[PDB]
């Protein structure tokens, strides 16, 4: 008289069917061997699955097949909550609105409103008053003026030639050969959108030309890319310098989103470190030259690199996968690259496998390779930026604000922790 | 010898070795580009000639920004090719680094890759296909014995031929560091990796066998087998990449249509496309396959047929 | 990350289950509860790699060899266990190796020879016999005691290393 | 030299010591010289911090008072604490109003500074009223009405429908309406009109003020959505 | 009477207003009535809030002091402000220290209360030494070491090593060693020993003492991780 038992984690065992012996006593040894306890698990019999008591005699179950499923009764969990009110710009992590009076975790810095308490994640993973007024603190250059420069490199959709037009200018030779009239019109519209733009941290857009094939003319930049300094010379950066770079990079993304233009291609190659101090970004927008047209349509064709692509843009089940969340995810990968100094997925050499495992959600960037001097708040920010779902990702105003807060909080957090406070919360 | 090489193959190998002995150091200024042979996924191939010797060779340039240490490591790893000598491998001359570019000097092949031949021919006769498979198996065996290296990138684009009918392989993964470097370069349209290797489990040449079988099927049908032809698509005798990968992982593999292909060939491709890599036969078991025996028994004037199909005058 | 399927085989009573339970839970079972089938999972770092071990502990009683054969077919490497006080269990290592060859349809299967119960007095299978048998198959020999835990990790970790070599 | 006081207040800002900052800026106000655009922000923020802290204290005390509903003198003690903090808040607001009406209102060369000062006056009257109860509440409500009307007229006349000051003034006026007059219809109408005006010039967003304007607009949308009920 | 003071202190803590609560607890302990652990926890938290805020302010001010050197004589007035802040800190520190000798240390009825008071004395000695210099700092740190050793000996001889209070005492002692003796080796060894002792005594505590231990152990792991380099 024996009973065959199926166990979680695709395991199994057989126990004898002795009279006077319960199922719980029979399987206690197996559960202890497998780090489980009967009280936190359920037992079912095949008859399709019928739950039975743990105290049931195994003798009456002779010849039967049993299955064990783990229960869930005590999530428990907690954070160290201290009441506090922020006098600068801040937002609830859950409710995404302005935050004047609420609660704060001393552990990780999670902030939420009084009314948002029941929605806070359980695991410390590392008639109301209205709001108020918070504190305050046709442009084609004619031919004969473009100096055909020297070939430099070829990217996802273009080629680089540094020419002369009233000084050094950057010219990108597009890989598109035959633009459709509708495609040409849309290209002109987007160029006109870009022309009336100007910012300290965005490269100037300087028109275009169409006589010598079709190419884009932009302001040339001196120096080198971020990707070079992170992985060519392997020059390390200090916390102040690194967070400053991140803050500057985020500064321009808010501007671009304010003018309602999706970057779609923020990879570490596309960030310049001009004059060794100022972050400048180029090579953005241009929806026309990507997703090669089959006619009067531009059905989405994937192109470029895959490390900085978000899961949804890979999945391609959405009509307009390139949304603000794509730029958010790109910024997350950029933060990770700056913080670790190692490219993501450094243990997989098959790009097909990388694509597949990103698409099914099975693989995410490492979170243990971070250094041991980065404050936990930046880790929380980085973790939040890389969420699989696109709905819960933050938008760039919030990330800019949190970066600003953690930056101004820098001088006091360098030293080690001291004595922590007690619970000081009511639940 | 020490191998099963006839007089012709041995003599041609000796001649190529003698030609290599006439080639010394390689530099950028030592070669002049004659024509472009095609652009790769992250590079391009140019027909070049070594002016100090006048020999016309094939040169592939790879653009990948890496640190000098990795460059020198790849240079050291590339030196193994000198001891590699087999009729089934594209001849090489050498490689060097210059101008932030990776250049490799290899034997120029006038026959071109199988992709252009298939494009200009539509479909390939089974007799022609059978001859290539045995040479592929022998080359894979040579690589696995002499160097224990799995190609991992077996596809029609990596097979070159000549007007003489000889078949050789290339683009093998000899340098693992270079393999890792090219991993994060750009994106492709269609792939051929085995479903198990997508799961992080290594089974060496089983994936190569699986990829070879699918490549042979595609060359036989004149269409990418994924997705399988539907009704009128099969009667003719823009899918997303993620869709293709998921379909490959979670669908039964396709098969040759009945009647138009010999049952031995259908059994061979079924064995070569077993979903379980463990159940898939190895090179030894595939060698003793009845279809392979028939192919060996058969004799085909492949060189003349290829010249006629391309249009070359003998 | 890396999963290894390990099968423990050998004659009844040699200590297959006691060895497995020492690996999984660091506890020695002194009772003799004959196995019909038992499988376990254990995550362990071996040579710097985080390994998921599936341990398939089989019946020594030949009455249940059909179940044993189903476990063997899924396995990647085999611990072939005898007891140092049971000469027939030692002689029957040949039987178990032949079973592995039959079920795996291969003569090239990772295997480690384990001589268990080395804490006992009056040992009757000597070191020279055991090392000669392991040598005859080209496999490692590990002495173990499930009671003292001597050799337990070495036996399983060596098998993992043999599987890696074979891959 | 007032610049020394300016630097002192700037240091105190990051020092998070707001009482000393308030006193230092009050000294500069007492100097009786016309202020710059920059210093006005510091003054407003400095007083706003203290007023907001006191407001939060009053809110939590009132919430506790509504919560207890017992029979004990703890409620009386809490009410005494509430009246004490209300008294000190009244003193602070009176000081701010006096300084404003004696130095800033009399000397307003540029209309924008006048609009800002009137907005401050109205918001501080609202701060008074939210604890005020009785005839004095009605009087300060009327004074806030006058200030808001005066500011709104000049804003509609000589201020773009995109500049942040006008947006904040509209927000404050809407809040004052919704809280004091409890007239959601007109407040919603004003909010919709202001949002439409802002959307009209959705392009004219220069480097100087891009995030603040859109942040205010988002807050307006949120309040309108909340008021839809 | 005293219960009314307790309610007042709880209300103040809820409203985050601290100085009034500090004075209330000071008079509560000056009354000389029996003091329980729950009551003194409120006093400790109250003093901790203000002292930590002012410590942060001093740290920021000192950072700004050395932020710029080749400039005008504004660093001079900045350091004058810093000295004023330091004097303010010294006054409250002296009051706190004298409070122990007045009521806490003499009215010592239970060993864990003595451990708690000595730990507080050492912590505030370290706080003073943060700004103290020279012979005064040396004397203060010697006094801190004396209290540290006395508290640790009693903790070792009397109660279990798995209680959170002992863990906090060890952590603070290690931090003091790092910040004064600057001996990473001795402090690291002591921290590792304490962590191992805590790990040995696991799964043997009460329902209430299941969360404090987690935070303390996490902090210990963080300190060891940072100090390993
Ligand atoms: N002294 C000693 N006894 C051991 C050792 N290993 C196992 N035993 C004892 O030998 C008996 C059989 O052990 P067990 O692990 O059940 O053997 P098994 O090979 O799994 N038997 P089966 O094939 O029936 O499943 C038990 O009484 C066990 O305590 C050992 O190393 N030393
Ligand atoms: N404004 C610029 N000034 C200087 N160099 C530039 C400028 N824009 C592009 N480049 C160079 O262009 C090279 C390759 O072209 P890019 O398209 O910028 O790179 P890329 O990232 O491969 O292309 P994409 O579309 O961004 S993926 C880079 O390595 C830069 O050195
Ligand atoms: N040995 C060769 N002899 C003659 N032509 C060759 C040879 N190798 C490559 N070519 C040609 O050059 C082109 C570019 O080389 P490839 O590296 O094969 O490009 P590719 O096919 O895009 O790269 P993959 O990785 O194989 S898809 C090929 O498509 C052929 O037309
Ligand atoms: O060429 C390659 N991939 O294709 C490029 C995209 O078309 C390739 C790919 C991997 C690799 C590892 N070590 C060398 N490797 C290559 N080089 C190579 C190998 C053999 C010959 I013979 C000539 C060669 F250039
Ligand atoms: Mg190729
Ligand atoms: Mg057993
Ligand atoms: Zn938390
Ligand atoms: Zn919220």
Residue numbers in the entry:
A (entry chain A): 155 to 201, 204 to 282, 360 to 370, 449 to 738
B (entry chain B): 38 to 274, 307 to 383
C (entry chain E): 1 to 167
D (entry chain C), E (entry chain D): 2 to 230
Verbatim from the authors:
RAF-family kinases are activated by recruitment to the plasma membrane by GTP-bound RAS, whereupon they initiate signaling through the MAP kinase cascade. Here we describe cryo-EM structures of a KRAS bound to intact BRAF in an autoinhibited state with MEK1 and a 14-3-3 dimer. Analysis of this KRAS/BRAF/MEK1/14-3-3 complex reveals KRAS bound to the RAS-binding domain of BRAF, captured in two orientations. Core autoinhibitory interactions in the complex are unperturbed by binding of KRAS and in vitro activation studies confirm that KRAS binding is insufficient to activate BRAF, absent membrane recruitment.
Addition of the KRAS GTPase domain (KRASGTPase, residues 1–169, stabilized in its active state by loading with the non-hydrolyzable GTP analog GMP-PNP), to the autoinhibited BRAF/MEK/14-3-3 complex resulted in formation of a stable complex, as judged by co-elution on size-exclusion chromatography. The elution volume was little changed as compared with that of the autoinhibited BRAF complex alone, suggesting that addition of KRAS had not triggered conversion to the active dimeric state. A single-particle cryo-EM reconstruction at ~4.3 Å resolution revealed that the complex indeed retains an autoinhibited configuration, with KRAS bound to the BRAF RBD domain and extending “up” from the 14-3-3 dimer, positioning KRAS alongside the C-lobe of the MEK1 kinase domain. The density for both KRAS and the BRAF RBD was somewhat weaker and lower resolution than the remainder of the complex, indicative of conformational variability of these domains, but we were nevertheless able to confidently position both domains. Comparison of the present RAS-up and RAS-front structures with our previously determined RAS-free autoinhibited structure reveals that the constellation of autoinhibitory interactions among the CRD domain, C-lobe of the kinase domain, and the 14-3-3 dimer and its cognate phospho-serine recognition sites is unchanged. Indeed, considering the apparent flexibility of the KRAS/RBD unit in both structures, we do not ascribe a particular significance to either the RAS-up or RAS-front conformations. Rather, they appear to be two orientations of the mobile KRAS/RBD module that are sufficiently populated to allow 3D reconstruction. Thus it is not surprising that the RAF/MEK/14-3-3 complex is maintained in its autoinhibited configuration when bound to KRASGTPase, as this KRAS construct lacks the C-terminal hypervariable region and prenylation site. Considering that the KRAS-engaged BRAF complex maintains its autoinhibited configuration, the structures described here are best considered as “recruitment complexes” or views of a pre-activation intermediate.
